[PDB]
């Protein structure tokens, strides 16, 4: 349901959290097929057969069967994506409870988002929204290891400060050690940490789509944990991701307008 508050705050409330999580579980189990097949069963079967770690769902099917979620999706994509991670984890564990050792996580990708913006036109009005876009990869660094649930040795006493989740926005920083009570020079325990693959690509508008008097514009993009090395330089790629501003990128330094960089946490990369 809808109220005066914003969509993001709404979906942050626990009542609608349970509402939409239940709805996602419901159509995951019940949206059978165009022609009565229960396609999610077979998709999950192949997903666990390979241990793909990542499911993908069609936005047309999503919106058509259940449209409230589809409308909410570009507004506050991060929260919806986290909940659908949890719900997909529930359903895959239901189908194969043996999956528990397998990555303890499932990502979910959204395909065929209807409204494609163009890299020339991505303004303030798209921040913190899931957009679809096209381009060509001009650069793609190697796969690097990222912290995802990091444990820290308090190097005053070698207590293992527990596994802190690592959001993409700001680097996690423990306050103090629960044992010796010091905000000490903590340092990462290389082993108990469970890292996550991180790759950084840069897409740009294709010259076939650039206009007459122009320079093609380029947007960064971050691939994480399953999409790394899913695209090489020069690949014409569709990218779907949360156009994003609030990580630490900002020209707060001297000699600069108060002007922010941007990225795209890629949620689906599709070569063409």
Partner 1 sequence: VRGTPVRQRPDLGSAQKGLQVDLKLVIWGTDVNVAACKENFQRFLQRFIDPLAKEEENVGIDITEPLYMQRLGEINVIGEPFLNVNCEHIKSFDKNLYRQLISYPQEVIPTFDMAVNEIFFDRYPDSILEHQIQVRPFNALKTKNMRNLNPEDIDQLITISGMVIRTSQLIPEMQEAFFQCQVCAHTTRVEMDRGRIAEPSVCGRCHTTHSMALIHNRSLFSDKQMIKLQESPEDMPAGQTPHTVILFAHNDLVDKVQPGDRVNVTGIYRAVPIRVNPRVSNVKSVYKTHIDVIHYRKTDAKRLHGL
**Interacting residues with Zn ion (CB under 5 A):** 154, 156-157, 159, 177, 179-180
What is the four-CA torsion angle of 62, 108, 223, 197, rounded to 10 degrees?
180
Give the nearer residue to partner 1 in terms of CB position, either 179 or 229.
179
CA distance 189 to 191: 6
User: Closest separation between CB of residue 151 and Zn ion, Å?
Assistant: 13
Q: How far is the CB of 160 from partner 1 (least distance, A)?
A: 10
Residue 154 touches which member of partner 1, Zn ion, none, C-beta under 5-8 Å by kind:
Zn ion
Q: Of Zn ion, partner 1, none, which one sits near residue 18, judging by CB under 5 to 8 A according to partner kind?
A: none
User: Does 104 engage in binding with partner 1 (CB under 8 A)?
Assistant: no
Measured CA to CA, the distance from residue 262 to residue 244 in angstroms comes to 6
User: For residues 172 and 180, which CB has a smaller minimum distance to Zn ion in the complex?
Assistant: 180
Tell me which of partner 1, Zn ion, none is bound by residue 136, counting a contact when its beta carbon lies within the kind-specific cut-off of 5 to 8 angstroms: none
Distances (CA, A) of 35 to 32, 47, 94: 8, 21, 24
The least CB distance from residue 267 to partner 1, in Å, is: 31
Which pair of structure tokens corresponds to residue 71? 């409308």
Shortest CB 178 distance to partner 1, Å: 5
> Under rule CB under 8 A, how many of the chain's residues touch partner 1?
3
Burial of 89 (0-12, 13-18, 19+ CB in 10 A): middle
In the complex with partner 1, the residue whose CB is nearer, 193 or 199, is 193
Report the residue number, 154 or 266, with the smaller CB distance to partner 1: 154
Nearer to partner 1, 114 or 162 (CB): 162
* Dist. CA 230–CA 238, nearest whole Å: 12
Find the binding residues for partner 1 in span 178-197 (CB under 8 A).
178-179
Give the CB-side neighbour count of residue 35, counting CA atoms within 13 A: 0
> Smaller CB distance to partner 1: residue 178 or 233?
178
Task: Report the site for partner 1 in 120-179 (rule: CB under 8 A).
Answer: 162, 178-179
180: partner contacted, choices Zn ion, partner 1, none (Cβ within 5-8 A by kind): Zn ion
- Out of Zn ion, partner 1, none, what residue 178 binds, judged by CB under 5 to 8 A for its kind, is partner 1
Taking CB within 5 to 8 Å according to partner kind, which of partner 1, Zn ion, none is near residue 162?
A: partner 1
Contacting residues toward partner 1, per CB under 8 A: 162, 178-179
């Amino acid at each position: 349901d809808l109220k005066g508050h914003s969509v993001r705050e709404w979906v942050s409330m626990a009542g609608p959290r349970l509402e939409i999580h239940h709805r996602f579980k419901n159509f995951l189990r019940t949206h059978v097929d165009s022609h009565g097949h229960n396609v999610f069963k077979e998709r999950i079967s192949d997903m666990c057969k390979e241990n793909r770690e990542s499911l993908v769902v069609n936005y047309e099917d999503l919106a058509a069967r259940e449209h409230v979620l589809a409308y909410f999706l570009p507004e506050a994509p991060a929260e919806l994506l986290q909940i659908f991670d949890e719900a997909a984890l529930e359903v895959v564990l239901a189908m194969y409870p043996k999956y528990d050792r397998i990555t303890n996580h499932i990502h979910v990708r959204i395909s065929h988002l209807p409204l494609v913006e163009e890299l020339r036109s991505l303004r303030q009005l798209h921040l913190n929204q899931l957009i679809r876009t096209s381009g060509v990869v001009t650069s793609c660094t190697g796969v690097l290891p990222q912290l995802s649930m990091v444990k820290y040795n308090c190097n005053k006493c070698n207590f293992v400060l527990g596994p802190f989740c690592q959001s993409q926005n700001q680097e996690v920083k423990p306050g103090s050690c629960p044992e010796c009570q010091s905000a000490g020079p903590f340092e990462v325990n290389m082993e108990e940490t469970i890292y996550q693959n991180y790759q950084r690509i840069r897409i740009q508008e294709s010259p076939g789509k650039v206009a007459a008097g122009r320079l093609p514009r380029s947007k960064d993009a971050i691939l994480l944990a399953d999409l790394v090395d899913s695209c090489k330089p020069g690949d014409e790629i569709e990218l779907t991701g949360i156009y994003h501003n609030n990580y630490d990128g900002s020209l707060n330094t001297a000699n600069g307008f108060p002007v922010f960089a941007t990225v795209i946490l890629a949620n689906h990369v599709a070569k063409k």
